[PDB]
Amino acid sequence: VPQQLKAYGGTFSRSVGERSNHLVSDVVLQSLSPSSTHNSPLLSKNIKTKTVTSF
Amino acid sequence: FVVNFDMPTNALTYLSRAGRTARQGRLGQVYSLYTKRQGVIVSAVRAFLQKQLPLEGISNWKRHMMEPRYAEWRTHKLNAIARSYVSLITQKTIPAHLERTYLRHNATWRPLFHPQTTGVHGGVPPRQQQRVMDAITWKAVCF
Amino acid sequence: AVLLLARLQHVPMDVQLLNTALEVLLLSKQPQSCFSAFEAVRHSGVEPTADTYTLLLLACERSGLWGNTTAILADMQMRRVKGDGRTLNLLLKGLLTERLHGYSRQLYETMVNKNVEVWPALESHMKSRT
Amino acid sequence: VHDPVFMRNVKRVLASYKESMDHSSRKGMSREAFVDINEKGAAWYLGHMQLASRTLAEKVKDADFVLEIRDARLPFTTGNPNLQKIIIDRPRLIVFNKAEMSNEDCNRVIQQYYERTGNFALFTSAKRSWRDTVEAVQRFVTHILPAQRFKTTANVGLVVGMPNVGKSTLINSLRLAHEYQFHKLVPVCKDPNIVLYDSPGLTLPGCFAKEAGLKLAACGIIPTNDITLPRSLVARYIYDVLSAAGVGEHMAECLHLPRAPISFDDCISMICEGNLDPSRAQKFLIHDFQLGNLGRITLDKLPNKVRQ
Amino acid sequence: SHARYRPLSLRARQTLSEKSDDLQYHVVTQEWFGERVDSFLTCHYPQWDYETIKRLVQQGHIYRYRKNGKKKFTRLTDRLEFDELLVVPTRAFWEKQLAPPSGVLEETDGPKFKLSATAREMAHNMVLFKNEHVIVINKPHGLPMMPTDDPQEMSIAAMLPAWKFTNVAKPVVCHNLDRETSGCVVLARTRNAHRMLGRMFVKRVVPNSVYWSFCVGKPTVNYGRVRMHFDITRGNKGDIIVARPSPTKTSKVAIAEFVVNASALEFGSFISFYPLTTRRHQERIMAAHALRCPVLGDAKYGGDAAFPSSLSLFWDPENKGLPLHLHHRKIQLPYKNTAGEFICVTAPLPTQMEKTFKKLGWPCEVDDPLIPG
Amino acid sequence: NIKGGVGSFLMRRAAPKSIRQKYQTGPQFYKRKFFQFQKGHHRLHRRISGVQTGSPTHQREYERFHHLPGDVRTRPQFDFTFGETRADRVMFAWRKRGDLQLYQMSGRGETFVCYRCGYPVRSQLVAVKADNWDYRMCYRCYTNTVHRGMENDT
Amino acid sequence: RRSKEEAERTFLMSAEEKRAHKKLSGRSGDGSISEMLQSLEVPDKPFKRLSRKVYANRVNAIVHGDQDE
Amino acid sequence: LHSVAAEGRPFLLCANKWDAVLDQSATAEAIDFKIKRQVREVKYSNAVVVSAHTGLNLTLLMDQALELYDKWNKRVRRAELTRLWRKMEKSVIIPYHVARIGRITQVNTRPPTFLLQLQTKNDSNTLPKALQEMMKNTLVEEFDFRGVPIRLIQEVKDSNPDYI
Amino acid sequence: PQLFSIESYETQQRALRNIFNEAGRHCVRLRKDSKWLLEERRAFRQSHQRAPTTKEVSPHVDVALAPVGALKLSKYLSPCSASREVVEHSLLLHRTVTKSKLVQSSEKTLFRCLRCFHVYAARPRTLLRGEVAQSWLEYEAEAEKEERARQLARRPHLRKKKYSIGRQRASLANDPRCCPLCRSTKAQWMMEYVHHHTHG
RNA sequence: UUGUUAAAACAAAUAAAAUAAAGUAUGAAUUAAUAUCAAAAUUUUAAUAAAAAUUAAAAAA
RNA sequence: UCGUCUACUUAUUAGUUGGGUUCGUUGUAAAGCAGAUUUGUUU
Ligand SMILES: [Mg+2]
Ligand SMILES: [Zn+2]
Ligand SMILES: [Zn+2]
């Protein structure tokens, strides 16, 4: 008799940090969501967004 | 217009090819011929473009696109339970004796047991699965 | 009669019961059911006779499939059971409908040799074809 | 064996079905008069047949020919009024089923009028199989319809007829024949490339007037139930038609009556005089009119223009 | 009608808002530093209603640009900022294939109808339950809810100006009813009350309406749940309704719960419907085909079995003008009374249905415990 | 013909369909995509609760939420606790501020959905909009609506 | 299906009936709907509702072998 | 034959060593039955029996190969294509939910390819292989493309860059 | 000619409509139940938003007897007469309508059973409750059972005085839901029976 | 009470009366974390909460 | 948001005879649109 009680049949991924923690940096791009920026060394630091209207 | 004679296996090459044709608001077009091998990535990119999402984390490996992380599935499952909880309160009246059963199947968050090895024990603690199995077999061989 | 036959159970098999059930299923709503029963009993059981073959051919005439018109003749030949005049006439009619020229001519020749009467419409059709 | 709770559940639902279907009383509304089976499933159409004129025209324009199926007892009332109103450019082949019961004179009159107009009337009896009918239809196609341009294409016939007349039975017979030969449409003969296209709702009449229902129940098309339509309304109309014919001695000779009846009550009492109550006596009279021991009967009238 | 609006997804609406040029970019000088968005807009545009400004701001047609390259969407309670722009659409912005909200445009009432004192008395008699938010009236039999093809024929939609006892504008009917239906009709006084009550009449799971009907014949079960899928198609003179048991991509489901209250010798029966959907002739067609027993007087659906020889004892089958036994008996409201129970209003049966129930011996005025309140 | 697989967890970013649902510009009328509950709660509904430190002879029922800021710190106007009991078991009702009026239930908190925040809220405090009991508000959204001065508009 | 159609509850089916029809139309595994219907065709008498203590005493007596089912 | 059909070249079977066989009519029927068993437009070719030592009807094989090249470059008009598919959309039975084909116009020859313009704008609404097989089934017997492979190009409707 | 046989069927049906509307003036006043009357006064105030009218609530049930002509009509009509079915069905319908108006009364009335043929005085509402099959009569029965449970659950000793064997046996004799001789629930209105016998 | 047949018979099924199936000795097994176990109502804390707090007072076989 | 529409028209005469064939109130520009919305370890 198969196991009747089950919570999740499939299997979760193995990437703990972010999506596609196995690919090389030349194949997959890095995420830019605020949840992933504050963890990266470059994105968590200062970022300027103010613009200038004319030359 | 750019004609990708073969679908690139990664989003990095696709956007780099796509960038050349359209420059500074100029009208452009991309024709990417694909076969059965690039069927996975062409299915995600086509969906990523229709909903206007950034091509971040796109791969050709099918198991990579269908299997999510535990915490990411944790966030999505918590929202799916709430959306059913809102529709249950808004458009339904449940009796008193069914109040425990409705909230147990459509309104409560039930954590999994070791989601790392969830493919073996199904997410339910096997010490429970052993007690449940003793209830099935005792009434199966009795039948 | 169909209901009573469906209720029937645990009764020995005989050619009389076989042809009676064939008549029942022929006059029933589905003429193909008697053909199915004949194909079921074809493996084993009592041997069918010329009356049963006439019933099968009448059912085929009523329904209109006629896909096994030559199969019935092949079964009769391999069973090595002679057929009656009405059986051979219905087989002639089936072959003429299925435009099997060689088999129809052979059966007509052997019928004229046996000196067994045929249907007037079939005889007129044969004389008009010749 | 599956789950015992499921066994108990199916037992309970089967018992409920049994206790629901035990009642022999039949509901008033004739479910058959509105249900119409097709390839997608059982469908219920609502409304008359006049508001679907353009929906019928757009399909008769696409179909090659118009194969209609009517009943010989009452030709005109069974079909489509817009087909008779507006002339159809496509050739029409009208199969009158149950032709053994219709008036031979009226049959020859209606077939003469159809030949004058351009249509082809084919009268089919119960002893005749559908194979001769479809063969004659193929012969009509190869005689009247011009040759198709491309060899692979096929000529399409739009079938117009109620499911009680025999359209659905013909469709099922052709379907099973084709399936057995090979093992939304229906192919009949692949050598001349003839196919048929059915339209359920355009042929389903739906609602009907009182006299229309009387004629349909007398012909056997529409069902008869005690709640919606007593046997009196139809049997008195049958007797009134017989009296307009005036064949009282003929009624007596048919019903084995001692003398010629005078009124409907007299007819009922004389049929009652085997012994049986007036209800079953009227039922047997209607059954006689259905089976057709009374022959040469035409309930549908013929307009002056069709008689000219 | 110089601009024909078209369906637009969120992506297309954003693309059109980016492509358009009929915008006005208000700067925020030192004088308007720190003012709320709603106050700013209500001080700048005196002709725009406050509800219109609310709808614009909360839908996003009036956003602000903080010089950061991207546009920023704010609510009414948000404060402004120095050096940033506030983008407001102009009149010509709504002339493209983009549908504007309701309040931004001007809707002209045009010609109005003048009612007589007799019609006003009849409307005041039809009024059943009066409230500062909702007005319940008893619609008579054979009255058109909305103006039909004949413009000279009377209708309820033009009797609205006679019901506003103190409001500044006429009430708005919440849900329309069939011409033959003799039930209760609900009107909303407040323009906001109509929007708030419009949610109740969408497809639901729990019923809140009662339909009393008298069908010809007795169905098999005393209580049951009717369900069928409708397809409405345009025809030459009218519409064609196709009923299926199975779903379809174009089909719209219709569900009701019917209970047989009494049976008159299996030739006539009194039943109560509680619907869950809103479809044209829904309960009528349900009783006609599903229950296989048409309601007394539904000539349009099974006219032969509508007037039966069984009930011919009471009514003349040759007239065929008896009122269709279709009455919206009881309907609930979200408003509560002083007792705490929801207000469920009940409409009295027409005199013809009362005569029918008296001839049949059934009580005409009975409460319905299935729908509480 | 080509069968490509993509998980739904990637397309959840475009779950909202309008600006009000995505940028939270107004009240979500039972249409909210993403929620935020405190970590550890299994029953997904925000909780507005009160304390009980005495008998009703000394501590009134409307003094349970005395710790929460707003209208509860004042005396209610209507007292339905005496005489016959209401069907919905409402014990107090505060002054009708604009289009919103507050009500305190009895017994365990009836979980409802606030149309402003979109969350299921289990509390005794409920704010009814214009006497229409289909659109309710949690006390937190009620206090914020009043402080912003949106009680007449929302 | 023919029994259902004869009952004429096509438009009046409910949740339990629809679920039963679904689970019987679905091709089962170890089970067999033919044998299940043959076993259902038995006209045997049903059991009446009893109390918990009375039913436990019944079970104990049956285990001992002194009382019938 | 499947590999040659995938390239786009008209092929033709040849039964070499035809004089060494024992029965001439037995082998000719085994090949014909093997031919009709083929699928995907391979079946629509012919089989020529040839002997290289005796020299049996070698000129007939060289004549059929010349006819295949003429049909390989055959030019079909456009209006004839629309009338064929308009009447074919009705006569065939399509159980699959597919979008209506707007126009049919052959674009390139040798091999002759056809353009099938769809009405919808979605990319996943391509016709199944069963519908492509039926489309290739009629083009060969109606327009005498026997033994000639045919490609198909399903063009989805493209939107306008200005959108009006 | 014309539709002689059709008009004859319509003429006879029109006669049945008139002779049954004539029998309406012969009525037997029956006072309604005390609890049921207050149920009509209550439902009327919520429906019409007005005080009930003594002429509309009709506290006296107006039951109509079968017309004297109809009973002697089907009597002298032979079973072979085709016009007997159309008048028999007209009487069966009025025989049930008389039951529908009878159940609304609660005064003592003669009711005979058909099993052992015993004549006894009963109240029509409680006796014909199981035959009439009316949901509002079903819902009031479920409503009164709760009303009794509310009084008994508030005071358990209240059951001792109200529900006793002396009280239970007395109430059964006051509302004889079954014949005291055969214990059968099947009954018949004696007034309709004696009306059918002395005319037939 | 229902259904079948005929101008009373048969089959189903329960609710009233009647019959039995100890108060004697013989005597197991399921179960078992536990205070001489928390009668109830209110409120609340991470999912039935029999977990906590506030009122209140819940006898024994 | 449960609306309405098996007759008009062209001739003909005094009921007869041949041709042709929808409108509209209100909300909303999303808070709107397929389908389901059921659970008693109950015997
Ligand atoms: Mg929906
Ligand atoms: Zn809130
Ligand atoms: Zn008695």
UniProtKB/TrEMBL annotation, chain B:
ATP binds at R20, R23. ADP binds at Q24. The lineage of its organism: Eukaryota, Discoba, Euglenozoa, Kinetoplastea, Metakinetoplastina. Coiled coil: none annotated. This is DEAD-box helicase, putative.
Automatic annotation (TrEMBL), chain C:
Coiled coil: none annotated. This is Kinetoplast ribosomal PPR-repeat containing protein 3. The lineage of its organism: Eukaryota, Discoba, Euglenozoa, Kinetoplastea, Metakinetoplastina. It comes from the Eukaryota.
UniProtKB/TrEMBL annotation, chain D:
Residues 159-205 form the G domain. One of its GO terms (cellular component) is mitochondrial large ribosomal subunit. Keywords: GTP-binding, Nucleotide-binding. The keyword Nucleotide-binding applies. The lineage of its organism: Eukaryota, Discoba, Euglenozoa, Kinetoplastea, Metakinetoplastina. This is GTP-binding protein, putative. One of its GO terms (molecular function) is GTP binding. The chain holds residues 10 to 350 of 451 of the full protein. Transmembrane segments: none annotated.
Automatic annotation (TrEMBL), chain I:
Zn(2+) binds at C113, C116, C179, C182. The keyword Metal-binding applies. Keywords: Metal-binding, Zinc. This is Uncharacterized protein. It comes from Trypanosoma brucei equiperdum. The chain holds residues 144 to 343 of 343 of the full protein.
